[PDB]
Amino acid sequence: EIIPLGRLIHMVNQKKDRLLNEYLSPLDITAAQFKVLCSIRCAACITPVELKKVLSVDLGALTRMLDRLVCKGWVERLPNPNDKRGVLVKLTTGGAAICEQCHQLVGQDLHQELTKNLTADEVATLEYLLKKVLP
Amino acid sequence: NEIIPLGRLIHMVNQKKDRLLNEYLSPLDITAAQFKVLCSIRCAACITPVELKKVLSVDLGALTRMLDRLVCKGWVERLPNPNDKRGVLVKLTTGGAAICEQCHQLVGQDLHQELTKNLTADEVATLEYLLKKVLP
Structure with missing residues (x-):
C-alpha cells in the first residue's frame, strides 16, 4: 500500500x-459552519471575499451560510469604513461564545x-x- | 515551536x-474544484449528480453549474439514467479522461x-x- x-x-x-x-452535533452546528466562525474569530473583522479565500469555498454557498449564521445571531455585518460598499462580517457576543463552546466540546x-x-x-x-x- | x-x-x-x-493547475486552464470533480467521476465510472454532491460534499447548485462548465469543455458527457429517467449519469469523455490523467501527472x-x-x-x-x- x-x-x-x-x-x-x-x-x-x-x-x-x-x-x-x-x-459538534450537541450544539446544532456543522463542521463547515464552525470553520466559518473560527476564521471570522481569527480576524476581528473580515469581508466575505477575504473569507472565501481563507476558507477556499464557493462564494455563493458561503453567502447563504453567512446569512444562516446571521439569523442564528452569531454573525453581524458592519459596513466597511474603507469600502462603503463591501461589508465586514464579525462574530457577535453570542457567536464568540458559541464558537468557544464548540472548541471546548x-x-x-x-x-x-x-x-x-x-x-x-x-x-x-x-x-x-x-x-x-x-x- | x-x-x-x-x-x-x-x-x-x-x-x-x-x-x-x-x-x-493554472497553466492547464482548469481550477482545483473542476479537477476534483473529474477525479471523482473517474473513480466511479458513472455517477449521479446527487451521488457526486455527496462524495464531494459541495453545493448541488455550484456542482450543476460546474458540471455545465465541464460539459462545455467536452470533458464530461451526460447519459440519461436507465434506472431513473428523472436523473442523469455523468461520465468522462476520452478528452476529459486524458485531461484528468494529465493533471494528475503534472x-x-x-x-x-x-x-x-x-x-x-x-x-x-x-x-x-x-x-x-x-x-x-
Missing part, C-alpha cells in the same frame, strides 16, 4: 471533518479519536513532521 | 496542499516535491506511515 502524501492528507482531513460534525475528543491508532510516541512524531511541511 | 493539535495541523497542511494545487510529481521540500526521504516515509495509521 503505497499512497502519496497529498492524498493521505486529504483522506485524513476528511475523516477529521466527519468527526467534527459528530462532536470538540477539541479533546477529536484529538483522542484521530489518534486512537497511535502511540503518544507516534503522535509526537506525526505532529513534528507535519510542522516541517508548513514553512 | 508551539504545540499545535493534530486536527489543526492537518487542516493547515491540507489548505497548503489545496493552494499549491491551484498554482500547478501536479502528481511537483505537488509532492514542493510539499516535501523540507523533509528527508526517510522523514517523508515516516510521515506517510503515520498518516496511514490514522485512517482505519
